[PDB]
Write an enzyme that holds these catalytic residues in place. Structure first.
Site, PDB file in Angstrom:
ATOM      1  N   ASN A 160       0.806  -1.221   0.000  1.00  0.00           N
ATOM      2  CA  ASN A 160       0.000   0.000   0.000  1.00  0.00           C
ATOM      3  C   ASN A 160       0.844   1.277   0.000  1.00  0.00           C
ATOM      4  O   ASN A 160       0.453   2.250  -0.649  1.00  0.00           O
ATOM      5  CB  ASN A 160      -1.009  -0.014   1.159  1.00  0.00           C
ATOM      6  CG  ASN A 160      -0.372  -0.124   2.499  1.00  0.00           C
ATOM      7  OD1 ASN A 160       0.722  -0.672   2.657  1.00  0.00           O
ATOM      8  ND2 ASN A 160      -1.055   0.397   3.497  1.00  0.00           N
ATOM      9  N   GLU A 259       4.027  -5.105  11.939  1.00  0.00           N
ATOM     10  CA  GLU A 259       2.847  -4.242  11.905  1.00  0.00           C
ATOM     11  C   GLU A 259       1.817  -4.923  11.013  1.00  0.00           C
ATOM     12  O   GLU A 259       2.084  -5.134   9.825  1.00  0.00           O
ATOM     13  CB  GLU A 259       3.200  -2.842  11.397  1.00  0.00           C
ATOM     14  CG  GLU A 259       1.996  -1.845  11.409  1.00  0.00           C
ATOM     15  CD  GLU A 259       1.092  -1.939  10.157  1.00  0.00           C
ATOM     16  OE1 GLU A 259       1.461  -1.390   9.095  1.00  0.00           O
ATOM     17  OE2 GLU A 259      -0.010  -2.538  10.237  1.00  0.00           O
ATOM     18  N   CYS A 293      -3.325   0.880   6.956  1.00  0.00           N
ATOM     19  CA  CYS A 293      -3.413  -0.020   8.095  1.00  0.00           C
ATOM     20  C   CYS A 293      -4.061   0.656   9.296  1.00  0.00           C
ATOM     21  O   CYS A 293      -4.753   0.002  10.079  1.00  0.00           O
ATOM     22  CB  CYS A 293      -2.012  -0.522   8.476  1.00  0.00           C
ATOM     23  SG  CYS A 293      -0.827   0.850   8.827  1.00  0.00           S
ATOM     24  N   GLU A 471       8.048   1.285  14.993  1.00  0.00           N
ATOM     25  CA  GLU A 471       8.822   1.970  13.981  1.00  0.00           C
ATOM     26  C   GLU A 471       8.826   3.458  14.305  1.00  0.00           C
ATOM     27  O   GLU A 471       7.934   3.968  14.995  1.00  0.00           O
ATOM     28  CB  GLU A 471       8.236   1.711  12.589  1.00  0.00           C
ATOM     29  CG  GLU A 471       8.388   0.232  12.214  1.00  0.00           C
ATOM     30  CD  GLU A 471       7.652  -0.194  10.952  1.00  0.00           C
ATOM     31  OE1 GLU A 471       6.424  -0.453  11.022  1.00  0.00           O
ATOM     32  OE2 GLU A 471       8.325  -0.341   9.919  1.00  0.00           O
TER      33      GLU A 471
HETATM   34  N1  LIG Z   1      -0.070  -2.051   6.312  1.00  0.00           N
HETATM   35  C1  LIG Z   1      -0.494  -3.273   6.655  1.00  0.00           C
HETATM   36  O1  LIG Z   1      -0.514  -3.728   7.797  1.00  0.00           O
HETATM   37  C2  LIG Z   1      -1.030  -4.140   5.536  1.00  0.00           C
HETATM   38  C3  LIG Z   1      -0.554  -3.946   4.236  1.00  0.00           C
HETATM   39  C4  LIG Z   1      -1.049  -4.726   3.199  1.00  0.00           C
HETATM   40  C5  LIG Z   1      -1.993  -5.690   3.462  1.00  0.00           C
HETATM   41  N2  LIG Z   1      -2.454  -5.861   4.722  1.00  0.00           N
HETATM   42  C6  LIG Z   1      -3.501  -6.903   4.936  1.00  0.00           C
HETATM   43  O2  LIG Z   1      -3.142  -8.139   4.433  1.00  0.00           O
HETATM   44  C7  LIG Z   1      -4.227  -8.679   3.650  1.00  0.00           C
HETATM   45  C8  LIG Z   1      -3.703  -9.682   2.670  1.00  0.00           C
HETATM   46  O3  LIG Z   1      -2.854  -8.986   1.792  1.00  0.00           O
HETATM   47  P1  LIG Z   1      -1.880  -9.784   0.745  1.00  0.00           P
HETATM   48  O4  LIG Z   1      -2.141 -11.255   0.937  1.00  0.00           O
HETATM   49  O5  LIG Z   1      -1.991  -9.189  -0.628  1.00  0.00           O
HETATM   50  O6  LIG Z   1      -0.499  -9.277   1.481  1.00  0.00           O
HETATM   51  P2  LIG Z   1       0.513 -10.070   2.505  1.00  0.00           P
HETATM   52  O7  LIG Z   1       0.223  -9.622   3.895  1.00  0.00           O
HETATM   53  O8  LIG Z   1       0.570 -11.530   2.187  1.00  0.00           O
HETATM   54  O9  LIG Z   1       1.937  -9.435   1.984  1.00  0.00           O
HETATM   55  C9  LIG Z   1       2.837  -8.777   2.850  1.00  0.00           C
HETATM   56  C10 LIG Z   1       4.266  -9.178   2.491  1.00  0.00           C
HETATM   57  O10 LIG Z   1       4.471 -10.457   3.074  1.00  0.00           O
HETATM   58  C11 LIG Z   1       5.051 -11.306   2.120  1.00  0.00           C
HETATM   59  N3  LIG Z   1       4.773 -12.663   2.448  1.00  0.00           N
HETATM   60  C12 LIG Z   1       3.593 -13.353   2.240  1.00  0.00           C
HETATM   61  N4  LIG Z   1       3.657 -14.589   2.627  1.00  0.00           N
HETATM   62  C13 LIG Z   1       4.933 -14.724   3.121  1.00  0.00           C
HETATM   63  C14 LIG Z   1       5.621 -15.804   3.699  1.00  0.00           C
HETATM   64  N5  LIG Z   1       5.074 -17.013   3.862  1.00  0.00           N
HETATM   65  N6  LIG Z   1       6.876 -15.616   4.101  1.00  0.00           N
HETATM   66  C15 LIG Z   1       7.436 -14.420   3.939  1.00  0.00           C
HETATM   67  N7  LIG Z   1       6.896 -13.326   3.415  1.00  0.00           N
HETATM   68  C16 LIG Z   1       5.644 -13.542   3.017  1.00  0.00           C
HETATM   69  C17 LIG Z   1       4.464 -10.828   0.776  1.00  0.00           C
HETATM   70  O11 LIG Z   1       5.180 -11.271  -0.340  1.00  0.00           O
HETATM   71  C18 LIG Z   1       4.602  -9.323   1.008  1.00  0.00           C
HETATM   72  O12 LIG Z   1       5.959  -8.955   0.827  1.00  0.00           O
HETATM   73  C19 LIG Z   1      -4.835  -7.425   3.011  1.00  0.00           C
HETATM   74  O13 LIG Z   1      -6.115  -7.747   2.529  1.00  0.00           O
HETATM   75  C20 LIG Z   1      -4.832  -6.500   4.246  1.00  0.00           C
HETATM   76  O14 LIG Z   1      -5.906  -6.680   5.133  1.00  0.00           O
HETATM   77  C21 LIG Z   1      -1.993  -5.111   5.747  1.00  0.00           C
END
Ligand SMILES: NC(=O)c1ccc[n+]([C@@H]2O[C@H](COP(=O)([O-])OP(=O)(O)OC[C@H]3O[C@@H](n4cnc5c(N)ncnc54)[C@H](O)[C@@H]3O)[C@@H](O)[C@H]2O)c1
Ligand SMILES: NC(=O)c1ccc[n+]([C@@H]2O[C@H](COP(=O)([O-])OP(=O)(O)OC[C@H]3O[C@@H](n4cnc5c(N)ncnc54)[C@H](O)[C@@H]3O)[C@@H](O)[C@H]2O)c1
Ligand SMILES: [Ca+2]
Ligand SMILES: [Ca+2]
Lengths: 497, 489
Positions: A160, A259, A293, A471
């Site tokens: 995001n 976070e 977030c 952070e």
């Molecule tokens: N600012 C925040 O806290 C924030 C940001 C984005 C999404 N989200 C939440 O997460 C939900 C799901 O989003 P998404 O699935 O597209 O994002 P995600 O949470 O899976 O991605 C976050 C990061 O984690 C990495 N990641 C995922 N699985 C991993 C693993 N097993 N090991 C290591 N790294 C890994 C992803 O590649 C990315 O770099 C969204 O719908 C939202 O609610 C929160």
């Protein structure tokens, strides 16, 4: 008036960034990043494999030693040079961020790089103030401590605020004397690769900031498992955060900070001005198309004010300007991706299904120039109750939930009746109500008569299931060091044997 | 005779467990059962958490100085009951009274006294942004935290974990080692007698993989502090990661190097090596069990070690002059003996010891003789692995760069030390060692003011020092916006 003839050709295939240069991956794996306003491919992107990760760590180990042997002020100057470059290239970087994320240029050019550079600038000036302690024990003995770098740390980013996250993670890590390997979201890898180039141009030693695009379950897990990574800093969803915690626990002992989002409450007090309340509620729900977030997605309004408050929200929702993301007046964009839109729409359908009253929105935007984008209308549910799925779960789209309440003790209980705990805020002109309510809320980030501002000086992170660690602020520089205690015994050591 | 069957301590009183599970704690000097001890079951743990939630709210609503005075009252009781507590610790652990009565409670209470005085200094910050807005932060309690204790320093560990936790306004549920559960229960009674509110310090004996796991899995525990071995620490990390999100800090032992410089006085070096290997019969996590000696000094150094080993006084654990005890349990002795057999089998030269103690008054206890191997090499099992028994490994070296490399060539990183009269050598060597706890011309002192914990695989986080009090709070940032808020919509 129609707007065609807008084909944008693909960028060059994006490579890994290891040791001060782009290098081809050896994984056999690529993925595409899509422009969410048009559906066109922006670039094919190479994913780092396990051997690529190992090379990146060895590069980082070598670069960290060079970096840590510099003086504190030499480090400060190099990070300030990167700040200067980021200020010069703000508009160019913002356009790239808008292409990759769908966020309006009106946001990316004023917030994403500005505030990411702000944090790097802040930590650059604090490097010389990072000190250990001295403790006198007795005339014959004293203790001193050193704050030593951890070594090689890993940052795992979200889609995001891509370049902001990269700057907010890398800035304290680098300023503490570490190297960071940064794994951007596969949804938004592009600006992190630009940042790595900027750091090199500023004089950062090769290897101190390596960038590894790739899929979370592959590249990200290879990082969390690597035996020479001393710490992981993660931003993202709860589900992936739990995988990171589990995989790191199963591998080399390391600290993990996280976070993880939330379901933050906005408490409108019984003495609040409702235009101010509505303005805060709008900024707490519809910035970056609801993909923040800290958004205040549970808006608690006194029953006596609910009808008037609903009208003030409808009036402001009607002013939202979806459109050309490069147009000055646009302040609302598509969601980051088409899969994420599908998830947001499922949440909206559950709101309808479970009996919340749809005040506005609730569907995709339609017509020329929206039909090719991942757009969801700004959506407000009211008549909400605490058991509804839309009220309990983080949506991460433009979906506000309005809940009525009767008294202060009740609203505090309800605000806290969540597993989450990232942010919270209160609207009230009253001195006692403002501080006393805020002191009782179980959240790490609290705004009074405001929402969303996150100064570099201010530590931010979650309570409860929303995070571990913080952070920003001075404390985060310290958290990227480890304490060594040293006792100097000048008197004659006494053995009992 | 056996003690009365020991119950759980929950909400200011002893309460029978509901697990159906008991275990025995053995006196390692005699093999006799000291007591049957009840283990907390899953429902007992949930009751302890609800008790702690209630007590934490009472505790946290007191004034800072009110909390300080109650912890200081507990210190006063600990000083007054020092010898009685030490005698119980000696029965439960086998450590000589000459140790328990001078170190265990003394230094445990030192850390409680330290933190009691610091409560009123725990402050947030204030940050001006502009004329119309400022930020302030609060350091708030975490709520209910858990400590999981080890068996070598039972009451000292209970105090070093509970002191900062309580001083920061939390309640702690403490899970002592099933090998040494007795002094933690006594401590719980003392806190109540000092005026600690009910529920703020609850004590749940039980087995690690049962009671310990139930605690680490509980949804309402905000932080785990663990002391123990690497294997059980990994289980705690994994079970906590699969449960509620919580912070975990850990101290996990080491293979700490003692570097004798080429300009060291060898009597001083031998004295430091003796204290770094044979205190508490070798059952100290910070022990300097890899002793690096210049090749030119090795022969003379061995003679000096043999002379001091010959003076060790094993015997009546309540006699003033005794300075060496049995090991904490007969299972632990067996594991140490397997290490000793591997050093023999892998070709290390036995300098002394290497067997159990024998004869009247030793035959019934878990004694291992003070043991020293020399001609050791870095690939040997006894050099690579933590033994937690009285086994010193002497390793010869040629130059300073070499010994720094070999010192650091371990996954561990808890402690380290150097013996040298030279200013430059002392500081320059220590600054290069990858360890959290470093001693120059000494070993083993751990003042309340000094943060202690491990690098690398030896730990996460620190105990003691000002920073550990802060680590048991969480930061809330509050922005006061007094200007007119601007919305873009
Ligand atoms: N600012 C925040 O806290 C924030 C940001 C984005 C999404 N989200 C939440 O997460 C939900 C799901 O989003 P998404 O699935 O597209 O994002 P995600 O949470 O899976 O991605 C976050 C990061 O984690 C990495 N990641 C995922 N699985 C991993 C693993 N097993 N090991 C290591 N790294 C890994 C992803 O590649 C990315 O770099 C969204 O719908 C939202 O609610 C929160
Ligand atoms: N001070 C120290 O760091 C320290 C102390 C004692 C032992 N050790 C090392 O550990 C080795 C193994 O000793 P041990 O097995 O007798 O002690 P351990 O490390 O298993 O026990 C330490 C504590 O962990 C608890 N525990 C064990 N499994 C658990 C689980 N699954 N969940 C929660 N808590 C759990 C135990 O009940 C005890 O309270 C020793 O030989 C020694 O090398 C280190
Ligand atoms: Ca994209
Ligand atoms: Ca025992």
């Amino acid at each position: 008036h129609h707007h065609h003839h807008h084909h944008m050709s693909r960028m060059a295939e994006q490579q890994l960034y290891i040791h001060g240069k782009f290098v081809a991956a050896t994984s056999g794996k690529t993925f595409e990043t899509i422009n969410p306003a048009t559906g066109e491919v922006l670039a094919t992107v190479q994913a780092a494999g396990r051997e690529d990760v190992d090379r990146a760590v060895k590069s980082a180990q070598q670069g960290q030693k060079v970096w840590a042997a510099m003086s504190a002020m030499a480090r400060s100057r190099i990070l300030r040079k990167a700040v200067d470059i980021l200020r010069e290239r703000n508009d160019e970087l913002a356009r790239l961020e808008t292409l990759d994320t769908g966020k309006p240029l009106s946001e990316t050019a004023a917030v994403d790089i500005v505030t990411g550079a702000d944090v790097l600038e802040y930590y650059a000036g604090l490097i010389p103030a990072l000190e250990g302690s001295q403790i006198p024990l007795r005339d014959s003995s004293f203790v001193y401590t050193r704050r030593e770098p951890l070594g090689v740390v890993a940052g795992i980013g979200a889609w995001n605020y891509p370049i902001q996250i990269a700057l907010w993670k890398s800035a304290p890590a680098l300023a503490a004397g570490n190297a960071m390997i940064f794994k951007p979201s596969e949804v938004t890898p592009l600006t992190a690769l630009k940042l790595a180039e900027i750091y090199r141009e500023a004089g950062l030693p090769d290897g101190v900031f390596n960038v590894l695009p790739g899929i979370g379950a592959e590249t990200g897990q290879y990082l969390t498992e690597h035996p020479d990574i001393a710490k992981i800093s993660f931003t993202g969803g709860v589900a992936s955060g739990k995988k990171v915690m589990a995989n790191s626990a199963a591998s080399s002992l390391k600290e993990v900070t996280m976070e993880l989002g939330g379901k933050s409450p906005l408490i409108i007090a019984e003495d609040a001005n409702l235009d101010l309340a509505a303005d805060i509620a709008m900024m707490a729900n519809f910035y970056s198309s609801g993909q923040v977030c800290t958004n205040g997605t549970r808006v608690f309004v006194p029953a006596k004010f609910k009808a008037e408050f609903e009208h003030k929200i409808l009036e402001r929702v009607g002013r939202i300007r979806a459109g050309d993301l490069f147009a000055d007046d646009t302040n609302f964009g598509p969601l980051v991706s088409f899969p994420h839109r599908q998830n947001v729409l499922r949440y909206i359908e559950s709101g309808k299904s479970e009996g919340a009253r749809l005040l506005c929105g609730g569907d995709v935007l339609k017509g020329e120039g929206f039909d090719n984008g991942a757009w969801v209308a700004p959506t407000v549910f009211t008549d909400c109750t605490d058991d509804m799925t839309i009220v309990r779960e983080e949506i991460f789209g433009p979906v506000m939930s309005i809940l009525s309440y009767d008294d202060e003790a009740e609203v505090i209980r309800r605000a806290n009746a969540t597993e989450y705990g990232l942010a919270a805020g209160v609207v009230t002109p009253d001195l006692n109500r403002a501080h006393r309510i805020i002191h009782q809320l179980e959240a790490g980030i609290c705004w009074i008569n405001s929402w969303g501002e996150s100064p570099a000086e201010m530590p931010v992170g979650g309570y409860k299931h929303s995070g571990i660690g913080r952070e920003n602020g001075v404390m985060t520089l310290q958290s990227y060091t480890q304490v060594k205690s040293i006792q100097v015994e000048m008197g004659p050591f006494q053995s009992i044997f």
